[PDB]
């Protein structure tokens, strides 16, 4: 019913909490000292206490993860109503900020390479049987060639949706959701029971691949309802209008495929990305 910090393989003596790093829908994310570290404080009341036990076992699952392209999960302590998830701190800025920086060139080769790193990390997580469930550019960090995935798995326990008969959509969320998921959304749909899958994670990567070249999300113009219907019936943009080649547009065509089984696994996707010019 509780998670202590000496359960963990990282020897932990003291933990200093510093300044807030940023605003976020799921908990607060502070700077910390252990080396310096990143601490995410979340609060759960205690209701659905069988969900926290399920959460506990998924966290202990995280304990067995270690991979150069995956943020280092270092520990978690749960003293309800208060929870804390402690991961390594990522130097640099988020990929979202990088691609939206005019003063940073993103040649085709660089984008191939960034994508390949994300694919390696996600292939690792899949192999361990772990779905990210919220792959996006704000959850990937890039510091001069070092690419790390962040906040995998959190979305399940998150509760970021919570008005009366009206579901909260954040700006970038919809365009990362595969059609299977979009067709499910409803004002009382909940993250715990949404049909996430390995294929949905591949779809989200596909969105990131569009974002890498357009330097903006797909369906930027359009409102949420338009996006729900267009993505549900399978309508998807291409990159020709900025002059990108067939090779790197087939990537989207494969990753965004309407039928889940047509989407590659991450290992096959790694192959496909190796073969660009």
């Amino acid at each position: 019913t509780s998670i202590f910090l000496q359960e963990w393989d990282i020897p932990f003596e003291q933990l200093e909490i510093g300044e807030l790093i940023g605003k976020g829908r799921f908990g607060q994310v502070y700077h910390g000292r252990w080396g310096e570290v990143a601490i995410r404080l979340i609060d759960i009341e205690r209701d659905n206490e069988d969900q926290l036990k399920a959460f506990k076992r998924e966290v202990m699952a995280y304990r067995q993860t270690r991979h150069e392209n995956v943020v280092l999960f270092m520990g978690a302590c749960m003293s309800p109503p208060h929870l804390a998830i402690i991961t390594s701190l990522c130097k640099g800025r988020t990929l979202y900020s990088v691609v939206r920086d005019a003063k940073i060139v993103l040649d085709v080769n660089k984008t191939r390479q960034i994508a390949q790193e994300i694919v390696k990390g996600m292939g690792y997580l899949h192999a361990k049987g772990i779905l990210h469930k919220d792959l996006k550019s704000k959850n990937v960090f890039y510091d001069n060639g070092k690419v790390v995935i962040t906040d995998f798995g959190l979305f399940s326990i998150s509760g970021v949706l919570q008005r009366e008969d009206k579901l909260r959509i954040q700006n970038g969320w919809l365009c990362h959701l595969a059609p299977e998921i979009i067709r499910q959304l409803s004002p009382d749909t909940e993250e715990d029971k949404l049909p996430f899958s390995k294929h949905s994670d591949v779809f989200a990567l596909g969105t990131i691949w569009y974002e890498l070249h357009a330097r903006e999300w797909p369906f930027k113009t359009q409102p949420a309802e338009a996006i729900i219907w267009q993505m549900g019936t399978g309508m998807k943009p291409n990159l020709s209008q900025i002059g990108m080649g067939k090779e790197i547009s087939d990537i989207l065509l494969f990753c965004w495929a309407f039928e889940q089984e047509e989407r590659p696994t991450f290992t096959k996707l790694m192959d496909m990305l190796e073969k660009l010019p």
Binding site: R168, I169, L185, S186, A226
Partner: protein, 305 residues
Amino acid sequence: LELDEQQRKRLEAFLTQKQKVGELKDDDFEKISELVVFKVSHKPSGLVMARKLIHLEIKPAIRNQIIRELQVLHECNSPYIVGFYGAFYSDGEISICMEHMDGGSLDQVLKKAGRIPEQILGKVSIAVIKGLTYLREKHKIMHRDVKPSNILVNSRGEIKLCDFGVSGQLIDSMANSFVGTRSYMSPERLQGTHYSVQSDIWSMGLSLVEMAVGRYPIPPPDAKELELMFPMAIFELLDYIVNEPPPKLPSAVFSLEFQDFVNKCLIKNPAERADLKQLMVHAFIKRSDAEEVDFAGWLCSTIGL
């Protein structure tokens, strides 16, 4: 097309109350009640206004651009559009201060009343058409968000449109949108194609049937639910709107002019859908315009003022 004496008066009477303040800031206001939008008391000047606060965290340079876009509201003024007093920024919230409408929105009045009768809905149709015509002809702007919650009423008996999309940056600067179970978006807009005021006309038509029958009409009720009156995912509704035939009014209890009016508004092909000028000439509104209805009296007696 638009002219009147008593209508000219209150605009200017507003434009006298206009100058009764020059600048606005948070401490000028005392919270009167909750309608997020608040009824507020202004102290520099005795006017009671509605102050809406939009929570936004963005850098000053964008905020100053936002204010220049919202300043256009000082330029648009019409007897069918809620008057605007000013917009300021303070402590993470943009304030939009406008005329307080003592009847609230048409959704909440509909909530109180059982159904709204045809004759009021005729006057509502004219006011919406002429308000939308004004923005097209004078400002080259579409509303983009016509629905019952954005049509306001008062005890003097005026009905005016609000919450339209004047600021492209404010729309984009908002982090998160709220999509629920009722949608008033036109088919063409849902498919991401080119759209015009025709989409506003669809929204008006669908809003009118909802208020006339007392229920959001997609999906249509079954036979036995229409008798009693007299679990669906968001994508199912939207695809229903795009592919199934539009809602229609029951053919017993409403005039042919009213049924034809909504039908012309809800034609799915926007090229065939009625335009503002054709609506102005439809039998239903010309008939409605020449009618003696105490709208204030209807409102006050059903709501309780």
